[PDB]
Design brief:
PDB class: hydrolase
Distance between the termini of chain A: 11 Å
Strand content of chain A: 5-15%
Protein name (chains A, B, C, D, E, F, G, H): Lipolytic enzyme, G-D-S-L
CATH topology of chain A: Rossmann fold
Number of helices of chain A: 8
CATH class of chain A: Alpha Beta
Oligomer: homooctamer
Organism (chains A, B, C, D, E, F, G, H): Mycolicibacterium smegmatis (strain ATCC 700084 / mc(2)155) (Mycobacterium smegmatis)
Number of domains of chain A: 1
Strand order of the largest sheet of chain A: 2-1-3-4-5
Largest sheet of chain A: 5 strands, parallel
InterPro entries (chains A, B, C, D, E, F, G, H): SGNH_hydro (IPR013830), SGNH_hydro_sf (IPR036514)
Pfam family, one (chains A, B, C, D, E, F, G, H): Lipase_GDSL_2
Chain lengths: 215, 215, 215, 215, 215, 215, 215, 215
């Protein structure tokens, strides 16, 4: 099977949106978009889910040491070789107010992750090549009923409206594939941040078409 | 399904032993012990493969920034919740000569990893409980025909013969399940480090019993 | 007895306000609010006072290495197990001009301390559970006659008027208890920062009612 | 009242020795030696319990970030002013095999803690004087039936037999009071590390005399 | 003799102002203000000159590792015990544009140095007391003909006009002596930064009167 | 031969401008300006090319650890002794938006590199003197068709228009030679950043005249 | 031309051995082995001299921040692309007594440098492939008449006699070309460390054959 | 006058040896050897006293952040320009048991200090040349009656007997003046570490000749 690594945040993990903000559970394996993707691709492909809620591109979160994408990705890639493709959808969390990041800052973080994929040939002592990469801008954020979410994401929605533009620019420069998740879904979760069942479905269907086109 | 995370090194990844040391490839999904485990357990269980070649318990490898197990595990646990059990087989690489580690030092690195599992409840914003843990001592190393392997592992065999003892002590003290992989296999790969196909099969069949016993 | 840990700053320590700013002494044990609290609760409760003047939520003070709440709290919690409740009233010092912190920054620091309490089960090698937590916003600051206090707290009063809102939001999200000290007292100390005898009394009486409600 | 701070490790916390190593509970408030001290001294004195299990003098424990005594003490001193005396019994944990410390290294860690007490006058913005200090060598360790304790403390007993000598030397040189806990008790707990009830009582009655003698 | 340590920057070292900015030489020993001070005080006093050009209160200069006052002062004080008084005139260099420091930031740096003096009793193994301290605000900067000086000191003159106010506030709070050098001289050096012969004379005469008043 | 070290960025390396931004190749050895310089100088001189694309004066690039000029230059100078002259043309990359550097910041970085040259006498165990230095401001940037270049260089063109002024000021202060590359060429590369063949020629011819004048 | 980078220490720089230890000068361009290499290879090749005296494989020298080979090499590789071959002769300096390194430690430092060459494709934004690598063990050290050299290299000769073995093992394992400089020369310089003119010539003539053989 | 900087430890400060170890006082200005030096040299010279008790060559003391000689010296040199000669007597404290240093390690720390003097020309913005340096080995330690001194200096006497040899070697190699204090005095203070009055006098009279000889 052609092997697809899906590297991302809560949107990849499958965070179930709740009115009271948190805590929550995971979408069922056949509902979250990585599951929909695997179903839509069929047996000639394998999907590997590496989504961590609250994950950033490459910036340490001051409240949680687990969240820097770039600290984890190189070890993740070597762990899962042989790979054919890495889909990265990250940057939503970089727009949290407390990071004080501009869209350029966030694209630069994404550029680090693309470079980690591109330079990943061989892993630790193997003959395996580097997989391809697909850079995916998340859909823009939406209004948030929970006061804590409103606070931590102050200015975030505006920044997320820029990610498709800056990611497409970056990907064009680096000569890698790009897809805008916002072109196929809006962020419809009740919390204004996460996905509904339909968002997951529509995104999984769309990415399957991207995956077949690249591989 | 009940979800089983296999956290390990080349032995968990499935490094095929070769006469010329390196480079190599991965054992087939049905041949590496994580696959044999999955087969044996069946559809009521799901196995998650997080094996990284050259990984240590909790010590930075000066040649490669990817290899500190404790740097990665907390992020990995939160990525894969909900989890029922985490099998950890690590410690072989800690016995490389350049780490200058005693079996006690290695057991202490293992204690960090166990503590990371025991304290992992809720991950990022979830209602999920911590998984159980199973501490696994790898089998003792054997003589190595490749001079480079002989060099980096100088003194290592003697150290690996002590890991069942020190890990059993540790696990008893921490009141967590222990299993000695060396109770069912010896290290039979031609390089004196990695597993034969028959090593992988026997370890998988033994651990399948262990998993069913704990859950 | 049910055991209450009071973790805080000068307001918890019992700093006596003085016209010349500093140096000063501590309020008598039966006057400072932690003492009033203990008297009002009676023998079925025990109060443990961990107030350090100039303490912040989780930010190092450049003039004094002792002042980061989050650096100390985990060791403090393990020291005092068994515990039933931790009252944290901090954030006033985070509003000092030289920290350049917004109310969100300060709530994020408080979130770190709440997480330390929530994850504190077992301490070092015990069977003891985690205590509950009560997040307490301090009352807003007031005008300050001393020129040095005016300087270091420039912009501070405005920020302290926001802490009840941001702390309540945070606490709601994290599903922990919240109480606004500003709902029962104003900052009446002659220095514009610290408490009078009556402030201490009124706060101690109020928190006793909170403590009985939670335990 | 005259205020006595007891800064220590599990021996000061009141770890109940158990056959199975861990986990355990705290000796009752009237049974641990800090409580016996308080009883014996009476209402003219107040004892403050700052004992943290596994605490070292001034060395980071690689398994636990909470345990460096010197990281905590200056903050602790400033928290509890006004203080009349600080009793410090530490050094047992420094003799764990993985710290690779000599009795001299441990005495030097103790010298840091003494220096922190001697230089503590005024704390944060107060008129209060520095307390006196009493350097206490713990009693020598004994044979340990639990294999994990035997491992982590390998070589430790021999080191603890030297602490009265090196701490006496240190204290004489620094011109501060010294007391050897080993002059009145042996380590009689079933685990070979911690105290029996009779150990706690005798140590409390001896230190009560020491406290009255110094103040 | 009563021993006076003069801790400062180029203004204390005795930098000779030159039209071409730099390089330059030192004022003669009987012309620079520390020399004038020693002459005016007479044999009952001794002056010790510790002025380093480009020195800041407590901030590392990115172009020169030698320049952080607070990194050096504690070692300096212990070196020169017994001392009676420490005169600190610093803060001019903190106003360089590239430090992005406000007058409050600079007073906070000065507060660190005052604390180092106040806590300096005993040095390394001595019976000697702490000296007194005199906080001295430098005179305001003036127009600068050299384009490089204009650049590095952009915004500096305005900041230096605030130092007398913030230093006096600080000194009042900390209950230490303060003197404003700007009350007796203007910065008349041709470069707009350093002192003429007359500036040095007038300052030395003034400080002699301060020294006799304190000692 | 008199030996000239050319230390710089892509402009020194000889990056070929391309419409699609990147990747690209190097200008031929006799086309890039360091080659033109060597041809124009003749056999009495030797040119040593140390140009690294994306290099800054003295600031780490968050996407690439190779790029800090000042981290490399001291080792470079000792490597190439005996030297007669070091030409440094750097600062263009410092104007990338993500560095948030002002022209002063960039001149300060250049000042570090000049100091490294001036203090380089002897290298490692030699009798060789320090070479001279020539500070060279790059020509201003131009409009950039590629969206990624537009993004990373936002505000860059304006900053690069200031470098001749700030570098000349710096060089005047430090009493070293200065030349403005912008006085002889405009940035004509199709990407708005790099040089055409004619730019390289005109710059090489100009610098040859500078080199003969200094040596 | 095919481009050959010679990455090394004093032996590559061309340190002239002197009776009095230091200071010294560089062997003439036609006399050092890098020059003899260039002569022998002719105009179809170009040799690039990157030898730094006292350089180690990958360990910071506490007396000199310039000397960590691995700190510099990645920047150096990207500077000099396009490259066909990188010759690395390092490891002599790692055998200095104060580094406390074994031959294995040194081989591991060499493995870092090899890995930096193998992973260097594209440098900064180029289409260029990675060069090949040639691992070269230096010749064993000899007795040293200067007492300072005798001191710093105590135990070093014995270590250098092992480098051909461990580097051959390493290179075989990594599947990269190896050459032992000790197979063609002994260390004949009067200081027991550096090369005679005849040493330089023979090494150059041998490596010329090696270069032609690999390209 | 010609300016002589005396950079040292307690031996340069003038620690009065006492039976009870510590605390103590400073030898009178006319009795410490720096004073005897000044007397003997007369008014054509000026001596500058920079002796700090417990100072090491270049190693942080874990009990005291003030004691790394190399951290302070560059700042000290730039403070006291113009300088003609720097006398450095250090290395005794490096032989304390807890530093685990060999005579070679200590000589290397001394080499850092020498290098700091040799490279000190111009200080901050001056036209002044570097001073000369005189490397001085302290006299060997003697038996110590105080148990704390015996402990911290265990193995130290044997090390100090080697410093004249290793420092002579170092100085010869670096081509700088050397003098052995042990050629004229033995360590005769009652504590086995510090100097008698007659020790101070003889060292001063010998160094006075050395100073006149070098200038």
């Amino acid at each position: 099977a052609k092997r697809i690594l899906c590297f991302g945040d809560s949107l990849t993990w499958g965070w179930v949106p709740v009115e009271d903000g948190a805590p929550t559970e995971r979408f069922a394996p056949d509902v979250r978009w990585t599951g929909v993707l695997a179903q839509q691709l069929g047996a000639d492909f394998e999907v590997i889910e590496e989504g961590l809620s609250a994950r950033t591109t490459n910036i340490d979160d001051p409240t949680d040491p687990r969240l820097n994408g770039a600290s984890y990705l190189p070890s993740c890639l070597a762990t899962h070789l042989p790979l054919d493709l890495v889909i990265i959808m990250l940057g939503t969390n970089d727009t949290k107010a407390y990071f004080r990041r501009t869209p350029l800052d966030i694209a630069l973080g994404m550029s680090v992750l693309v470079t980690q994929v591109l330079t990943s040939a061989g892993g630790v002592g193997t003959t395996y090549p580097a997989p391809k990469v697909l850079v995916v801008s998340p859909p823009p954020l939406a209004p948030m009923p929970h006061p804590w979410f409103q606070l931590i994401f102050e200015g975030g929605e505006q920044k997320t409206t820029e990610l498709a533009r800056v990611y497409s620019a970056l990907a064009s420069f680096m000569k890698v594939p790009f897809f805008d998740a916002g072109s196929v879904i809006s962020t419809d979760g009740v919390d204004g941040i996460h996905f509904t069942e339909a968002n997951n479905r529509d995104l999984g269907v769309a990415l399957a078409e991207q995956v077949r086109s690249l591989l």
